[PDB]
Amino acid sequence: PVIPLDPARRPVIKAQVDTQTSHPKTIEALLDTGADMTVIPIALFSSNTPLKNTSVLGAGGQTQDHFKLTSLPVLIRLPFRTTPIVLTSCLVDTKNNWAIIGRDALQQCQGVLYLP
Amino acid sequence: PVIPLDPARRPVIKAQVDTQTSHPKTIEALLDTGADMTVIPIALFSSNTPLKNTSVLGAGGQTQDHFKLTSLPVLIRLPFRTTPIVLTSCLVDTKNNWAIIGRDALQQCQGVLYLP
């Protein structure tokens, strides 16, 4: 689709995310051109799966413990497209349950920004 | 222009920014659909400018000190538009001097996200 940009409304999409560690779930995710890497809520993973420690720089400072990195690829299906986005690795939100589609996924989408 | 999306290459643009407290300056800004509000560097202001305290939530955490709010509108000229974007207020990064064009500015130049 064409998604209009408005400060009062976050640009969101429904995405089916398969962590390959439990059953795929459809979630609402922010579409974010400022994110290098996609973020998935920890809730989407089985309780025992191995994750890696990671450090992330964001607007509030540098966090050492808020995010992890996945061990397995993540598959994402978007409502209009038949082909899964395959992400070799992405971020995992161990706290605030953020779901954010970043430029890794938008590239495999052929997503663009358009400014007339 | 059409701006393609690549995890390895941040979508950045040259923006002439007028704070109205000294002359217009060129910065290189991240184009960011996950940003509610535009962020400009404190380095654009001279030492004694009245700015408001504000609390901002990002991936790094909630911060009450890193960012301030402008007192006056901010004027932003992009290379391919003749009419200035005028933001009633925006964020001022006192800590790292980041430059981020958010949805406030992108709405005014009719920016869209496009997913085929």
Ligand SMILES: CC(C)CNC(=O)[C@H]1N(C(=O)[C@@H](O)[C@H](Cc2ccccc2)NC(=O)[C@@H](NC(=O)[C@@H](N)c2ccccc2)C(C)(C)C)CSC1(C)C
């Ligand atoms: C975890 C990933 C996303 C790290 N990368 C980044 O964070 C990059 N940025 C991004 O990816 C931005 O699009 C970011 C998305 C985000 C919003 C709120 C909590 C977590 C993530 N947006 C912000 O940080 C922005 N904060 C907000 O817009 C804030 N009002 C907010 C609060 C809760 C939900 C949505 C929005 C500002 C400070 C730039 C205005 C801005 S700074 C960055 C390093 C270039």
